[PDB]
Design a protein around this ligand. Structure first.
Ligand SMILES: [Cl-]
Ligand SMILES: [Cl-]
Ligand SMILES: [Cl-]
Ligand SMILES: [Cl-]
Ligand SMILES: [Cl-]
Ligand SMILES: [Cl-]
Ligand SMILES: [Cl-]
Ligand SMILES: [Cl-]
Ligand SMILES: [Cl-]
Ligand SMILES: [Cl-]
Ligand SMILES: [Cl-]
Ligand SMILES: [Cl-]
Lengths: 301, 334, 334, 334, 334, 335
């Protein structure tokens, strides 16, 4: 009777944050697949948490089985390191596109709700003051700029999923804009996750989104009250936290003193999900320092 | 000994015209795959022409075998009908991308020269005065406009090929700009090749039907006679000194830049000169319901190539060729 | 050391009652496959009970591994709902026959005991007074009566298994005749096991819904308490001296021969005795919209078995078991 | 535009006689698959006859390709030899059912007309005065009589095809009743087509071997000359106004109703009239070892068809055709 | 963070002794696959011991996943029973070579350290005083002596691994020379590990059965206590600065050099001292029905290793361990 | 009715000579598979010659279909170039063993006669005076000498075939000893058939390039004219009353027993007699760089009714004659 949520790549930034919220705030069962459990801590001991081992490129039977068993499908496995797009464009395509296509097709076959991570980068060099999921044009560079294979792969997957939507697939696309929070993803981790630049730590701006706001929108998508999220595409970002790299540096140091254009349009996200981001840039970063104080070891790695 | 050219989807516009030039002007052997031969006429009786049967979505072993056998690989099979992009986007992805990828991957495996039909559509809503294959940005609409699945499939394919190029694949991408001539592909033929709009307009003229113009036919296009298209293709296949390896060429005549309305008027005027068409053409009503110029600098310089045919010669050649084959012209839009 | 019994589709009527008997009366290990465990209660907690997850149409490797590991193989997964035969005949074939064949073939490959649920329906419109698994002819209606795809699929599987038997497969076929008891499978559960007619009547009765008597409801059938069914299965699994190898057993009580009408009336009269049912049952009308008696002589002598439960005992047990689980009862037809 | 007919298992009795009619009386194209051509006479020469090599159990790609290419699909490959049903029941299931199913599914996928050889045996031990494809019940013996695996495999294939018909498959099932004529398939040839008893009896006769009658050879059967068989098929393939779509036709001559004893005697009487046969025919004794009328009303009415050849006409044709081909006749039982 | 060691075929001689030493003397994690855990004792309790179920011939996905997950890959599954080489050489090839090749290939793909059990038998009838892994010639009998398919399959695997080493594969081959100790694998267990001749002799001794000496039992061999074997394996798996990468190591004690006859005598003589063995030992008849010294110079010097255990100390160790498990000793030859 | 002989890798030395013998002396049908026909001359125009296209690593369906169709199965496709064993051992294994295994398994399934080219190399460093297929030990070097992956792959295949023989497979193994004749396979052609040492010596001689003599070139070998090799093969394919079923035959002329140096000198002397080769041949020097190999053929002679007729000298003279209007094809032997 309880809703079953399938998270592929659950040891990630998103997976462990989403699992926590689910276990703590609902009666849903979590089916979570990954290779390691190091980001989950105590979640795995929870009686509605069901971790299992597998890789989407290898455990095809075990993955398909859980797609049939579950109600809502989150395939979160994906290469999302900008350095890899340039150096090994083919690895990006093989994992983010080719390895995920069967999982999409299983969600179709078994009539499930596919909640898929598109990308904030899908807009590319779009010039709109606000990136509109229903309206903005999508602009990439020429073929001889291979970094664009990431955006192009994600866009094609969006259109393939949209195509299946035209034939009856219940899907929601979401595009996270620079989610940040405790438990940041490791630079080389194969998951849609956290903002790289913030871990590492100049006038390029981006919209930073505290993870709790991101997760809240996701919960509403999974709950899908009245089927409102079906067929829809949502930017999940805080456009009020549009800060430059210099500003990030300066605020992070000003915050560390206490302890011893790519703007997402989110109108449809707010209205349709009854959602609004609560965390200011300042709140967001304060939260990350409060969290990592003990674990200086986990920070470096 | 002789160079071997594999054409997947040979029974049609590019298949016919390319095979013809190859047989008549080189010692190369042609291996052409398709389901039927009714567009090849007498080419099959030539000793250097090797037609064989197969379908790229079915005959995987027989196709791969030919990729290992041949030197140059041209996979022309694809849905390239604008209406289908909107109504059936999944079928466009499945065939144009998904079913061509194993062919690309065989070309990688056996060290062959992959000569792949990219598309003029890949530039999308590009604002550049000339679409430049080494420089222009590529712009599509949002996900809720599914017609863009074609340009997006074709883009991702160009990038996957580019990624193999970075690992040693010998490839050339070509982007035909509105190739037109005798033996146009039927509107629903799943082959890269001939300008659909010109084909559609020709079918209307000969059936005596109205020609419908969106936004008063303001859309401008660069029209290219097939002989010009083929000559650039020949140079790519020859690949003197490896000059075409790693390259992307628009193959178009930027000097034949006309609006869709100008195209309709010109074809209507031309139809009236021919007694085979005039009477159907008389019945045609033009009814009512932005700039796409190819840069061809690299194409002309690297390949020693220049387009020779004006808009006028192009269309005339077309009307000449169909005059005793009006039934063929009429069936172009069925 | 100990016998390992593999049950595929363990989470239901047969899986539950059998497993229980195995755990309480033998030293055998039970390996049970299904998607959920809600029909197994605390059985999973027992050290000789090994539940594992999978679907026969998906987990090919995991199922075959278990066929190699275990000694006796009971593949229970099957659409066995009459309504479904008529409306989705292909689903019945795909699951009951096609998805079960690889499992049969692994039992062959690894030299296991295949204990396979055939069906009392295999006899079809047989005219014999007693359905004899070694002698009775098997009669179905024409192709335009798709209801018979179920019996025909099951007959073909029995013949395939028999063909494997000719080549050395150790098999036993069993044909349950309307097994009934606690934990009936709900009507769309895709498992061989419980009498659908008794299950649907129970559901409708507890819901105060009218009952359908097809063709006046004079078709006579034989009803069997689950404990009698299970006792016989236990004998088959133990297979003392190889007595059940190559054999085909009807498991049912021929003395419990009642018509559909008689069943409905009996169940109505019984429900009136219980406080949980009497109110809803009073609201039940019978609505109008030959003999199927099993020979069990070989089953009796070869397995040293005899059914113990009368019709009344059986139905009584069922009503008692559901008194505290009225929602389970209501859900049987959901 | 011309209709394309696909025959899998073309090199034999049906493939030869069907192909000949098609080529002689229509503009349709034949695509015929087999391993050899020795039974096709001079047909291959015909420019509308397209023979190709392959085996339905091996050449999956080449078979699927031709299914997509063609309009009408006749899969004739099947073990149809009564002795093999008994001794090798698994091979019968594997070829007749399991290897034909992917062909049925390709016909579904590509929207083709599947014209499938069901069997006269599907009725089994039916008691009806005439075997009615829309109504007659179907009765086989028990599982311990494996001969029934042929009829049961064929029945299930019919129900699977029927299930696909419910989802939109354009099919016609046909059941030939002992078709006979020149070019009989030898007894161990795996194709549906010719009467094996007639073929075997001819074998013995030409070889001077005794003919065996079982249970006194009293069983009546309907015998059909091949030309009447083909005329029905042609009407099916033509499918005037879609009338054959979703139908099941017995194709036989109910007026040619003869026992096995009578068949032997008539064949022996007839052989004595032929110099080439008489010396061998004299040595044949009938040795004792220890009714099947087709209803053809729907066939006659929907196809506008009537069987024209008497049993006597039919046998005379056969003896005439083999008269200067004694070796071939002897080979029918090898 | 911590090194992950994958052992395929863990429930046996090497598996138990290796996992124990890993858990006690490192912080590494063990991932061990097998069908059962009965040879693992209490090792499964350890938090760094991860038993999982599977068979390399079936659970392809689960095996490949663990190869990607783990750092060092030990595939121990193989028929290594001499009589089976003779009786079923195909089974030996299929398991030892064909079924292990995909495991090797995954180790290549994912960049892992392949630590592979080659065999002392690979030298065959080598005439060298010391079998040198870097220099000794490898000598087998003719094709009509099927016993050599074992050594031939193992040889080819070593050369295939060496080929992948040339391309970057990080491998180490190890060749155990008659490893012996508690927990000997039963004779028909398909795992590389323990000395079959010693296991067979112990089995007969405890069963009061005769011992067979082929050709007087004058064949000499080197015998190695298990702790000495494991110590070398630990160094290989630690692989300090890649010292064992690309290397081939015999792991034997050349000072324990005894004939089969001397082995039998010494085992019987030592059994007399044990009251649990003495009585069955007196019933044993020794009945009539080449030096094999490993060079270990590279093993000693590269790995910092030396065998500590004398032959007599090794046999007494074995006799002590089986003292309270006579059942287990007797099951060795079943 | 007529016997059907399947030759996989028909466009080369054995394919050509065998196909010719079959067409001229029997009523058998030849089904030959390759990528090209340029080594087949006129043969394809013959009504009992059926050439078809395919590659054993790719056209699995089309190859298996032909195995089922035909009666006798000759899979000739294999890397057999000594330099490639050392440079690319994996490719040798993959083609010679792995890609041939399914063909063997099809022959088992469809009850055919598998006639498999094993190799004289299978004996390895055998010390026997005559290499006996039924008795001689098989000796290779260590793992770190990858040249031995060829002999080891071919040995394992012979043992897998033998194992299927034990369960009923109709097989014959044949081991050519230095078959030499017109139409030599170039040294990089992936086919069993011709002596590489003779082929490379010819190639270098006609190109006026040095010839290498490994370890002084003292090792003696047996050299067999192709006609003698084909005569034995024909008897195997006919297989009258199953004489060849389950058997292993060396096919060589042990009377043509000459050292590698003797071969060089003999070829150089022969080259000097032909105007097309003489100028090139004068330029060749022998380069030394840092064990007899006699086939026993008693079973082959007595079982098959066979004996080699051609001397070393006739054999090489026939080769030199054949190539003299085809100098470019001789030079290509080592390209
Ligand atoms: Cl870039
Ligand atoms: Cl805010
Ligand atoms: Cl659109
Ligand atoms: Cl111009
Ligand atoms: Cl029905
Ligand atoms: Cl009773
Ligand atoms: Cl029978
Ligand atoms: Cl009549
Ligand atoms: Cl042996
Ligand atoms: Cl010592
Ligand atoms: Cl070497
Ligand atoms: Cl001689």
């Amino acid at each position: 009777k309880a809703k079953k949520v399938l998270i592929l790549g659950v040891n990630g930034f998103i997976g462990h944050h989403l699992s926590k919220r689910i276990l703590e705030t609902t009666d849903w069962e979590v089916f979570g697949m990954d290779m390691q459990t190091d980001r989950l801590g105590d979640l795995v001991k929870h009686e509605r948490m069901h971790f299992f081992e597998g890789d989407i490129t290898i455990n095809k039977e075990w993955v398909e089985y859980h797609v049939k068993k579950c109600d809502v499908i989150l395939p979160l496995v994906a290469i999302a390191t900008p350095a890899t797009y340039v150096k090994q464009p083919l690895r990006v395509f093989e994992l983010d596109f080719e390895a995920n296509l069967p999982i999409v097709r299983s969600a179709v076959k078994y009539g499930k709700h596919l909640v898929f991570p598109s990308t904030s980068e899908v807009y590319g060099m779009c010039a709109d003051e606000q990136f509109d999921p229903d309206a903005s044009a999508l602009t990439y560079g020429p073929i001889n700029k291979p970094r664009w294979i990431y955006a192009c792969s994600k866009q094609l997957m969006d259109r393939v999923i949209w195509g299946y939507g035209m034939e009856g697939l219940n899907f929601t696309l979401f595009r996270p804009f620079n989610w940040i929070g405790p438990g940041l993803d490791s630079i080389y981790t194969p998951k849609e996750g956290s903002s790289r630049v913030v871990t590492q730590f100049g006038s390029q701006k981006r919209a930073f989104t505290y993870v709790d706001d991101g997760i809240s929108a996701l919960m509403k998508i999974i709950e899908n009250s009245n089927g409102v999220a079906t067929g829809k595409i949502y930017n999940i970002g805080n456009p009020n936290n549009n800060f430059s790299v210099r500003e990030l540096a300066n605020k992070m140091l000003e915050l560390a003193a206490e302890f011893p254009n790519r703007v997402p349009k989110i109108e449809n996200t707010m209205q349709e999900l009854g959602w609004a981001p609560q965390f200011t840039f300042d709140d967001a970063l304060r939260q990350i320092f409060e969290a990592y104080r003990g674990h200086v070891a986990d920070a470096r790695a």
